[PDB]
């Protein structure tokens, strides 16, 4: 019907464009550029195929996708592949899939359809979303996946921050939870683990944090115009080669991207559309500020790539399939 927001589409295209450009120097292996190019074609075709759906059908599979995502997060710990100390993928040869992507896209719908009703603010405000979040994060910490669990916990927070808003009770709850859990884990933490966490907060320990400390020096190489990885550190490769006058251009597009995500989130009148589009823009922005925070030596290392820049077999498709569902619920904001 050509009633989308092309400004949001252009911002997506302009960053994936620099994505392949930055993948000219980062991951120069032509075998890698092929699997990324075919990932965009499937990422754009899937989002094109998702447009052949209605919003009611989308929210009709909220609990099915949520319940199916739990079946995958419980099955990934059995017949999964361990890539970096954790089984969190399904690779049967030419296939590449992660059960954490369906968990995020499934929990966003499930917690939007459910929280459309009244949340009992006194005690049970943090009951239904807590009952729908712990099974997800619990099956992620048993991988283990700390980066993916933080995106989930931040997305659920955004949904509750739009509907619940227990500001007085919420902040006091976090201050208590942030003091009792460290007081319990630190005594039971091993010296191998205690030093590990202390090295995460302060990155000045070379044998593990040398490359991550080198990132802070690598970025500041060029101004006004060997890294550990090309995935978890796309920005460092890009920030170093393009100086500072470029860095603002990337931060600009990502700033404008998260703006139209929140802007279109306001144009939707229905509550579940407010929740779903806020939890998506929150889940996407949280990855950016964390990924660039790790690169800029501010946020602790979590192991999360940067959208629209990272090399992803299924991550690019999943993020594009996520953007398609955003354009779906926007054109369906009026009709029932």
């Amino acid at each position: 019907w050509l009633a989308y927001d092309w400004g949001l589409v252009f911002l997506v295209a302009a960053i994936v464009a620099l994505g392949f450009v930055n993948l000219g120097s980062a991951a120069p292996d032509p075998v890698l550029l092929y699997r990324q190019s075919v990932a965009l074609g499937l990422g754009l075709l899937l989002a094109f195929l998702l447009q052949f759906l209605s919003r009611r059908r989308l929210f009709g599979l909220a609990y099915p996708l949520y319940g199916a995502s739990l079946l995958l997060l419980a099955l990934v710990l059995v017949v999964g592949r361990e890539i970096n100390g954790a089984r969190a993928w399904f690779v049967l040869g030419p296939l590449q899939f992660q059960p954490l992507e369906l968990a995020k896209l499934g929990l966003l719908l499930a917690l939007a359809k459910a929280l459309e009703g009244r949340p009992i603010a006194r005690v049970w405000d943090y009951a239904l979303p807590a009952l729908l979040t712990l099974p997800v994060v619990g099956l992620l910490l048993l991988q283990p996946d700390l980066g993916g669990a933080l995106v989930v916990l931040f997305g659920v927070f955004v949904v509750v921050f739009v509907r619940g808003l227990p500001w007085r009770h919420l902040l006091v709850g976090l201050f208590a939870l942030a003091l009792l859990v460290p007081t319990a884990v630190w005594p039971n933490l091993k010296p191998y683990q205690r030093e590990r966490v202390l090295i995460v907060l302060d990155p000045y320990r070379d044998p593990l944090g040398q490359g991550f400390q080198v990132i802070q020096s690598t970025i500041a190489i060029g101004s006004g115009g060997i890294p550990f990885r090309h995935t978890d550190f796309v920005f460092s490769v890009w920030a170093e080669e393009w100086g500072f006058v470029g860095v603002v251009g990337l931060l600009g597009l990502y700033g404008l991207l998260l703006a139209r995500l929140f802007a279109l989130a306001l144009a939707c009148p229905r509550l579940s559309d407010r929740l779903f589009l806020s939890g998506f823009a929150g889940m996407l922005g949280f990855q950016v500020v964390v990924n660039l925070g790790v690169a800029l030596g501010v946020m602790p290392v979590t192991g999360l790539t940067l959208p629209l820049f990272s090399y992803g077999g299924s991550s690019l498709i999943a993020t594009l399939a996520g953007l398609g569902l955003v354009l779906l619920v926007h054109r369906d904001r009026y009709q029932d």
Binding site: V162, V248, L251, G255, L271, L296
Partner: peptide, 27 residues
């Protein structure tokens, strides 16, 4: 029902500004 969304839009704006400020520091 909408003011909380302006805050997140402001939060992610200042967050990317601090990242832009930390970058300018090193650059």
């Amino acid at each position: 029902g909408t003011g909380r969304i302006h805050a997140l839009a402001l939060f992610f704006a200042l967050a990317l500004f601090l990242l832009g400020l930390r970058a300018w520091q090193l650059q």
